[PDB]
Amino acid sequence: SVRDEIRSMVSDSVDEIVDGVSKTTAEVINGRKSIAQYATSLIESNPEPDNVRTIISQPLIKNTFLLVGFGLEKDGSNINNDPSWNPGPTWDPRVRPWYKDAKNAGKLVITAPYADSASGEILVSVATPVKDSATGQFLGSIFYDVSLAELAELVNEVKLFDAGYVFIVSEDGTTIAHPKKEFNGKPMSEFLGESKINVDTHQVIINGKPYAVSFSDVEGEDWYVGVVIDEEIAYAALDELRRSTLIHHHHH
Amino acid sequence: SVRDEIRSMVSDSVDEIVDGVSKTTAEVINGRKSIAQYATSLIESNPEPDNVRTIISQPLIKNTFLLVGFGLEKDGSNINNDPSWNPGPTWDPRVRPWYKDAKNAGKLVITAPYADSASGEILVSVATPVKDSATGQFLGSIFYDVSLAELAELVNEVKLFDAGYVFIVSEDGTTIAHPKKEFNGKPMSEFLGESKINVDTHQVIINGKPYAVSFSDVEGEDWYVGVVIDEEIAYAALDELRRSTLIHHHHH
């Protein structure tokens, strides 16, 4: 009954992977949100353009986000942290989804996926409203852009026996991050066949071949981490481990 | 040969635990170092006391560190982020280990454990020198205090089968964080018997009982994570898992 022991380990492995990655993802994303909130709070204390630039141009900010910009309600001007960035002459921050999301929420949010103004790539942004200390009046919003390809790479650093991959979706099945960039912002049905999240681990047929799919909620956003695993490949990897370990122990 | 399979899983589990925790620890500590560097860089841009206070008094800073203070070379004054903190009337930041460590290193460092001036608790600090923009002359140093009890709790969040615990030591065997506060800053021999780090997983006798001990380097500091595990307890936990899984599968 070795086949049984290993098949059981595969099934359990699928669940432990998705649970672990959802915890990892929550930690990373919450960390970035906290950095964004800190920068925003400093800006609210003194929103003078030079001070804004100093706050958003430090290595921590440059390395944590793709791009950061503060758009002003008064005139649609912006202060950003990349002199090379140019969204075109008619760009108005006040009509962008990050700006409206933050304005309407009145607190830090993460946007749904949308197409970047300059690059056209699908991304999400952490977005915060800026209120002046004295009056609490809306001065504008700040975006902190998040690369979805980077997020996909990050969650796939997990060991998966070469048997599949991890992805992130929102509660309605919208793809947040897939190893294949083409699916970002698109319905997960485009790569899973299934359109809605079924949290219980289950089999799915893709390209006429069976895969195990499982999900786990991400605490802090309305996202889930999903995994797609070829259990035949996983079984082989684990069986190899078992045999290799035995042999090695005979001579050590 | 079920005993063999499980004993093997225990041995492998010991190693995977220490490796995983050392990766986790590196990530968390590097994150805190990056936040400290960011705050320091903002302060260097404008070290006026009110601006310093604004930078260090935000929730992110308050929540990431126990306490933050900027000590001045000129007169031994300080600006800190806790009006309730009082180290006594003769406290001079310029003679403290965090201050000298940062001054001498000329870059961000983490101190060896030392006794806090106000509380007497053993802690470590992230410490950074502050140089003025124009002249690059030393203005003073900033400490960002790290709770060792919190760090011990953090690294012990890992699942250990109720079979033992995780700790952190520096390369010379000095305890950085132990679940039992009494050992912090003391030689690891006080709880392990062994005085030097042996990275290969090995058996150690403690209180006349055998334990498996393993270590893994932490990238970014001269620290190691160690684990002490009762393999008899671990075997039982894993055997229970195997049996429970089998039974559950018979009816599901």
Residue numbers in the entry:
A (entry chain A), B (entry chain A): 57 to 308
Pull text from the paper.
Extracellular signals are sensed by methyl-accepting chemotaxis proteins (MCPs), also known as chemoreceptors. Indeed, we found that Mlp37, the closest homolog of Mlp24, serves as a chemoreceptor for taurine as well as serine, arginine and other amino acids. We determined the crystal structures of the ligand-binding domain of Mlp37 in complex with l-serine and taurine to reveal the molecular mechanism enabling Mlp37 to accommodate these structurally distinct ligands, l-serine and taurine. The ligand complex structures and the mutational analyses demonstrate that only one of the two potential ligand-binding pockets (the membrane-distal pocket I) is involved in ligand binding by Mlp37.
In contrast, the l-serine complex forms a dimer with a molecule related by crystallographic two-fold symmetry. Taurine and l-serine are bound only in pocket I in the crystal structures. The amino group of l-serine is in contact with Tyr-170, Asp-201 and Asp-172, which are triangularly arranged around it. The carboxyl group of l-serine interacts mainly with the guanidino group of Arg-152. The indole NH of Trp-154 and the main-chain amino group of Ser-173 also contribute to the binding of the carboxyl group of the l-serine ligand. The side-chain hydroxyl group of l-serine is recognised by Asp-172 and the indole NH of Trp-141. As a result, the entrances to pocket I in the l-serine and taurine complexes are slightly open. Such an opening would allow larger amino acid R groups of other amino acids to stick out from the pocket without significantly affecting interactions with the amino acid backbone atoms, a situation that could explain the ability of Mlp37 to sense a diversity of amino acids. The l-serine complex, in which the hydroxyl group of the ligand points toward the small opening of pocket I, reveals the molecular basis for the diversity of amino acids that can be sensed by Mlp37. The slightly open conformation of pocket I in the serine complex enabled us to visualise ligand binding in vivo with a fluorescently labelled amino acid.
